[PDB]
Design a protein that fits this description.
Chain G: It comes from Saccharolobus solfataricus (Sulfolobus solfataricus). The structure is cut from a larger assembly and holds one copy of chain A (251 residues), one copy of chain B (294 residues), one copy of chain C (207 residues), one copy of chain D (117 residues), one copy of chain E (201 residues) and two copies of chain F. With 207 residues, chain C is mostly helical. Chain C is 56% helix and 9% strand. Classes of the chains: A alpha+beta (251), B mainly beta (294), C mainly alpha (207), D mainly alpha (117), E alpha+beta (201), F mainly alpha (122). Chains in contact: A-B, A-C, A-D, A-E, A-F, B-C, B-E, C-E, C-F, D-E, D-G, F-G.
């Protein structure tokens, strides 16, 4: 099953996602394109979504990189003989010779292969990894960027105030760009119909998270709406997908 | 009959499989590979294939393999010279009892050149009797690929070659009439960019007794089957790894070392056996000079 | 006349510089030297052919000075044809960033500017990649950024950005020194930028 | 350990309306930067006057620093903004903490209280 | 039977090729997008999204491919070719070139704090979005079920990543000649109509 | 290249020293051109940018001749080329200011390559 | 568009003021700043029209300029009025700073024409 989403966010004021910012410091430059103007990279979207999902799940296992307990090799063998896809992943990663069809081949195993198998087990047993992928995991979520034809860019300067005496500190003149916007359109495709994804979207509905730099300074705050945003669930490959209001899916 | 190939793209050539990598070996395209591609296209179109088909190896347009009497004036450069109508000015005395060591005197002037038989040479200009030439250098790239089922398990690599318009001589047949573009290379279903075959004016070259420029890697005899005898052979040894059908069982990958392409051989008699042109070899011909491309 | 060496990448270029600084003093013959850096799994014969081609191409036309060419194969196999194609494509005689034919003293000045001539510093970075990678990345990040922008735009735009970077550089900084070494002393619009970047990249990948 | 941003236990959102008592003048970072108004105009978001989030954050941080210094406690300190040797909290053997650093962050630690426009 | 397919990336699509002269952390193929990338990505999408009534090896090891082919069907493997049995089934070629380029960089934010990790900064070369890519899929065999499988492959390519998890939208610019050639089936017509326009208007 | 030549002509026009000044300052200030670029970015309209530069010229804050050249250049330009031209102008002006190049050196250089030749020599 | 209206209004307002011993436009920059400030403070268009009418009646605003302003600022949104007033102020300031003679500038009715005139000389 493939779940297709077209999310829209009514962000307060503007946002800013910088990059490179040349040299010489001075102003802060938001990343450009050259032709399309400005955009939000898909990697930033994925990072924000991973942060939101991690907040939603609140899994202690995920907090310590899934390295807090020793996984018995018997359990690993049981999962390997019980899950065909997990066995295929392990064989494709550590090698067919190392892991036979039935068994672990302890004689050929060593420290690093065992560590890799344990990490694979831990990450495969984590919903966040199963959704967003990992170093060896397939993935599960594809996020497009949000290139905006609008290029309205204003500059919001800043100054530091000496605490000992309330005046401008003549040491630097911080200058920060800001991209004013009202509706950020991002297309998201998820290949894992996870209640984690629904819960993350639900959290974004009411609380809402920040995106971009200087979020501590009122720059970048998105909130998902249930009116403009729309979704689509695909289970049959012989029918044209149908989009409907996101409220029905989320509420 | 002449053919034209508007390649202008990256294609592969003779590969030297290393571990799991593949490397370009021949800067040119061998006749066998071409013939295989042109016959595969016939098979795709109809399926009825014929072994009476021969095609000369293609070379970059306005290029040719080097022979002994076409050396480079510099020991390390790439500038080649030769005398107009050299083979007519050469040979000739081969009928007479003229010492060959005296015949192959390349010291026309001081600091006599050194030849590199079997290298791609491009015609440059007239420059009185000594024609200007330049060695041909092509463009090559490396295309490495990964192996997944999402997650890597192995690795592979390839080396492609860039070519301009290509020319070759084939057999007069409806095959070229009915075939227009040919997938060529190690990976025919993966990695081709653009291929096509253009028919052009018919070519009538004569093969008879006398000194002949062996365009293909000629072979004097095989399995005792004597094809021709040569008074003096000037060239280099080559290794052949190709394809030929002997009608009945087997008939693939016969490995027999041969003469390097562009070798000069003074053949004085032939035989009427099964010609090896369809096997991609023995494409000699009488030429006045390298200007025979015209 | 035949010299072949397979020193580790973390010490190769400084080794060549120290060896060929006094080549005229010792033998009196100028040397054309080609240096490459391939992964260990790379085939050896094709690497030999490619490095021979690079050495032949990196020949000073005057012939009164030795030449050192550096070319790192990070994620690409090496062959003579590939080297020829790359040199014919990127390197040129009017507006180029790949000099290839680099004087030894220029590389010596570059190493002195980068504090890499001393073998003690090289070995300290070599034996401890934990700090070595960080130190070499700090030393190479600015040059890598310049080469990145070079790959973004054409020759004129790249030169404009280089001059801008030189302009916006505080006193006693390394960026101004590197840019001045690159620009000053070049007659045509030929500037060793890819060359210096690859010289640094050899040591960078050596650890 | 004051770097607990990896694990989020609770999130509280404060929503309200700020009404100025006196003649509120916006920061006007647009120093000698006219856009569509006379002389030096106050900043505004699409012709709508806007209080900068940075200004409120700076005022709040100044107030918090004043409070912390008024506490006069060894366990709680405030470090200079320009200093790069400051740390948020010290787990040396009970430890020291920086209240403004905890709240609005520092170079070593990001903020915990976000303020919008 | 030619299939003139035009694909336009929905994000900052990029692939890593290689060059001796390169500085960007993420390189790019000198020619552009190779047919091998498209073919492998399509096979992966088919195996992961397998339409009903078909069989997929889903294997990387050629020995594992042979072991799966011990029974010897692997509909997907037949469509993409046996390792050593069939000459081939279909070909992919790309004509358009000269894409747009820009260098960007990415960081890795710390988990315990919310600041970027010191030394986790790497760059990436990308192709600008909304750039059209045209490639033709020449299916030379004579089979209708395999042709339907190939059409399903192209359709599933839409719901699939292509390079650094970059979203794509496939469009078919030929329905008339496809229907005119052979097997203008109602299901074929429906899927071709579905592929005729972009998923995202 | 050609935009580079236009930008360097603009920059050498703008590098003319401001008379009756205590310090040897350029006629056009860095903040002024920065404001030009920022205003063009925020206000995506070439006519509004022309009005802005005209007002700045009337304010005696930028050179009259430089303003004339800017108005002539951007008289009938689009936005995409206008922002590129302003960026190039910013680059070349910053290079001139940092390099401490006086007007008498550049004088009337017409080609950017000649300017970089001078910079390489100097 | 709005820029053409603003240019025509500024040209009408820059005509020399008779019975004035010094060469100056009929209106002053103080009047334009007062117009903008009044519109900003009162946030009403009819009040702005009243202000314009009173300023015209004070024998300090040209009657043709006042008629142009009243014609433009009716059945018009507040934002559009603000934009038009800003354009008028900027054009007037440009003309004042450049010391453009009214004689050779009264014959243009298009903003592009004014731009061409300024660029040519």
């Amino acid at each position: 099953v493939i779940q297709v989403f077209r999310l829209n966010f009514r962000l307060r004021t503007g946002f800013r996602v910088g990059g490179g910012q040349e040299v010489g410091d001075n102003v802060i430059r938001q990343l450009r394109i050259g032709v399309e103007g400005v955009m939000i990279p898909a990697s930033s979207w994925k990072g924000m979504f991973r942060r939101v999902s991690e907040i939603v799940l609140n899994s202690e296992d995920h907090f310590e990189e899934h390295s807090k307990k020793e996984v018995d090799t018997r359990t690993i063998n049981a999962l390997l003989k019980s899950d065909e896809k997990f066995r295929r992943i392990a064989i494709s990663k550590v090698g067919k010779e190392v892991i036979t069809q039935n068994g672990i081949n302890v004689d050929k195993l060593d420290s690093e292969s065992l560590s890799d198998l344990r990490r694979i087990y831990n990450e495969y047993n984590c919903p966040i990894e199963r959704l967003y992928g990992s170093n060896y995991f397939a993935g599960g979520i594809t996020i497009s960027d949000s290139v905006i034809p609008n290029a309205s860019i204003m500059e919001r300067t800043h100054v530091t105030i000496e605490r000992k005496s309330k005046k401008a500190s003549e040491k630097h003149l911080f200058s920060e760009e800001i991209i004013d916007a009202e509706k950020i359109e991002v297309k998201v495709i998820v290949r894992n119909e996870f209640e984690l994804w629904k819960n993350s979207l639900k959290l974004l509905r009411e609380i809402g998270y920040f995106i971009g730099g200087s979020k501590s300074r009122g720059i970048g705050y998105i909130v998902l709406d249930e009116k403009e945003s729309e979704y689509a669930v695909i289970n049959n490959f012989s029918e044209t997908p149908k989009f409907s209001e996101l409220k029905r899916y989320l509420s | 009959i002449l053919i034209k190939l508007k390649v202008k793209g990256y294609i592969t050539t003779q590969m030297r499989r290393i571990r799991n990598y593949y490397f370009s070996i021949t800067n040119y395209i061998p006749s066998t590979t071409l013939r295989g591609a042109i016959l595969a296209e016939y098979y795709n179109q109809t399926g009825k294939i014929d072994e009476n088909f021969y095609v000369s190896p293609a070379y970059p347009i306005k290029t040719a393999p080097a022979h002994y009497f076409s050396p480079a004036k510099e020991r390390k450069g790439d500038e080649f010279i030769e005398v107009k109508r050299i083979l007519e000015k050469k040979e000739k005395e081969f009928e007479a009892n003229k010492p060959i060591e005296e015949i192959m005197k390349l010291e026309i002037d001081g600091k006599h050149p050194k030849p590199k038989i079997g290298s791609l040479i491009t015609y440059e200009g007239e420059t009185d009797k000594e024609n200007k030439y330049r060695e041909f250098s092509s463009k090559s790239i490396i295309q490495m690929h990964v192996a997944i089922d999402s997650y890597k398990g192995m690795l592979f690599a390839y080396e492609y070659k860039e070519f301009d318009e290509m020319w070759a001589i084939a057999s007069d047949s409806e095959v070229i009439d009915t075939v227009k573009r040919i997938k060529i290379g190690r990976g025919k279903n993966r990695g081709n960019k653009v291929v096509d075959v253009e028919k052009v004016r018919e070519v009538s070259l004569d093969q008879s007794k006398g000194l002949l420029y062996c365009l293909s890697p000629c072979i004097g005899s095989l399995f005792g089957k004597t094809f021709f005898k040569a008074k003096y052979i000037i060239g280099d040894k080559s290794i052949y790894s190709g394809w030929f059908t002997v009608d009945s069982f087997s008939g693939q990958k016969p490995v027999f070392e041969t003469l390097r392409e562009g070798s000069l051989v003074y053949v004085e008699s032939f035989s009427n056996e099964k010609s090896l042109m369809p096997a991609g070899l023995n494409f000699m011909l009488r030429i006045s000079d390298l200007s025979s491309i015209l | 006349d035949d010299i072949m060496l397979l020193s580790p990448s973390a010490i190769a270029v400084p080794f060549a510089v120290k060896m060929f600084k006094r080549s005229l003093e010792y033998t009196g013959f100028t040397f054309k030297v080609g240096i490459i850096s391939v992964k260990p799994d790379h085939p050896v014969q094709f690497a030999y052919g490619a490095v021979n081609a690079l050495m032949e191409e990196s020949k000073i036309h005057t012939g009164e000075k030795s030449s050192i060419g550096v070319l790192v194969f990070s994620s690409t196999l090496a062959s003579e044809g590939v080297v020829k194609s790359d040199l014919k494509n990127y390197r040129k005689e009017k507006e180029s960033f790949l000099v290839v034919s680099n004087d030894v003293d220029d590389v010596e000045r570059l190493l002195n500017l980068m504090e890499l001539d001393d073998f003690g510093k090289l070995m300290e970075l070599y034996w401890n990649p934990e700090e070595g990678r960080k130190v070499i990345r700090d030393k190479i990040r600015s040059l890598e950024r310049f080469v990145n922008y070079a790959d973004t735009h054409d020759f004129y735009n790249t030169l404009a950005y280089l001059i801008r970077s030189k302009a916006k550089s505080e006193e006693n900084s390394l960026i101004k020194r590197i840019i001045d070494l690159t620009i000053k002393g070049r007659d045509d619009f030929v500037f060793p930028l890819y060359d210096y970047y690859f010289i640094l990249k050899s040591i960078r990948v050596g650890i | 350990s004051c770097m607990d941003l990896d694990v989020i236990t609770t999130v509280v959102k404060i929503e309200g309306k700020l009404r100025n008592e006196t003649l509120l003048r916006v920061g006007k970072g647009k120093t000698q930067d006219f856009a569509e108004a006379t002389d030096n105009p106050i900043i505004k978001y699409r012709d709508r006057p806007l209080i900068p989030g940075s200004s409120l954050k700076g005022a709040f941080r100044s107030l918090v620093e004043s409070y912390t210094k008024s506490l006069n406690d060894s366990k709680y300190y405030v470090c200079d903004l320009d200093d790069n040797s400051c740390v948020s909290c010290e787990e040396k053997k009970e430890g020291r903490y920086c209240i403004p650093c905890i709240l609005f962050g520092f170079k070593d630690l990001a903020s915990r209280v976000y303020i919008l426009d | 039977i030619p299939i003139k397919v035009s694909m336009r990336n929905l994000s900052s699509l990029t692939i890593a090729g290689g060059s001796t002269i390169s500085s960007i952390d993420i390189p790019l193929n000198p020619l552009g997008v190779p047919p091998s990338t498209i073919k492998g990505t399509m096979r992966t999408a088919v195996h992961n999204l397998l339409p009903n009534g078909y069989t997929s090896c889903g294997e990387v090891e050629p020995e594992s491919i042979r072991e799966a082919h011990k029974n010897g069907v692997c509909d997907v493997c037949k469509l993409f070719g046996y390792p050593d049995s069939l000459t081939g089934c279909f070909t992919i070629d790309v004509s358009k070139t000269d894409y747009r380029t820009s260098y960007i960089t990415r960081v890795s934010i710390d988990d315990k704090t919310q600041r970027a990790k010191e030394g986790s900064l790497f760059t990436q070369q990308i192709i600008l979005p909304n750039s059209d890519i045209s490639f033709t899929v020449y299916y030379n065999c004579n089979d209708e079920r395999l042709f339907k499988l190939l059409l399903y492959s192209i359709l599933d390519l839409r719901y699939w990543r292509l390079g650094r998890n970059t979203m794509i939208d496939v469009k078919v610019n030929n329905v008339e000649e496809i229907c005119k050639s052979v097997k203008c089936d109602e299901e074929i017509n429906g899927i071709l109509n579905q592929l005729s326009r972009y998923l995202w208007e | 290249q050609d935009l580079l030549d236009i930008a360097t002509r603009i920059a050498i026009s703008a590098i003319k020293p401001k008379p009756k000044s205590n310090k040897p300052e350029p006629y056009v200030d860095s903040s002024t051109i920065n404001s030009l670029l920022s205003f063009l970015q925020s206000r995506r309209n070439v006519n509004e940018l022309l009005l802005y530069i005209m007002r700045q010229a009337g304010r005696d804050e930028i050179d009259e001749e430089t303003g004339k050249l800017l108005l002539a250049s951007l008289k009938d330009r689009e936005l995409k080329d206008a922002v590129n031209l302003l960026g190039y102008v910013k680059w070349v002006y910053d290079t001139l200011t940092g390099l401490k190049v006086n007007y008498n050196n550049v004088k009337g250089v017409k080609t950017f390559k000649e300017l970089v030749n001078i910079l390489s020599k100097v």
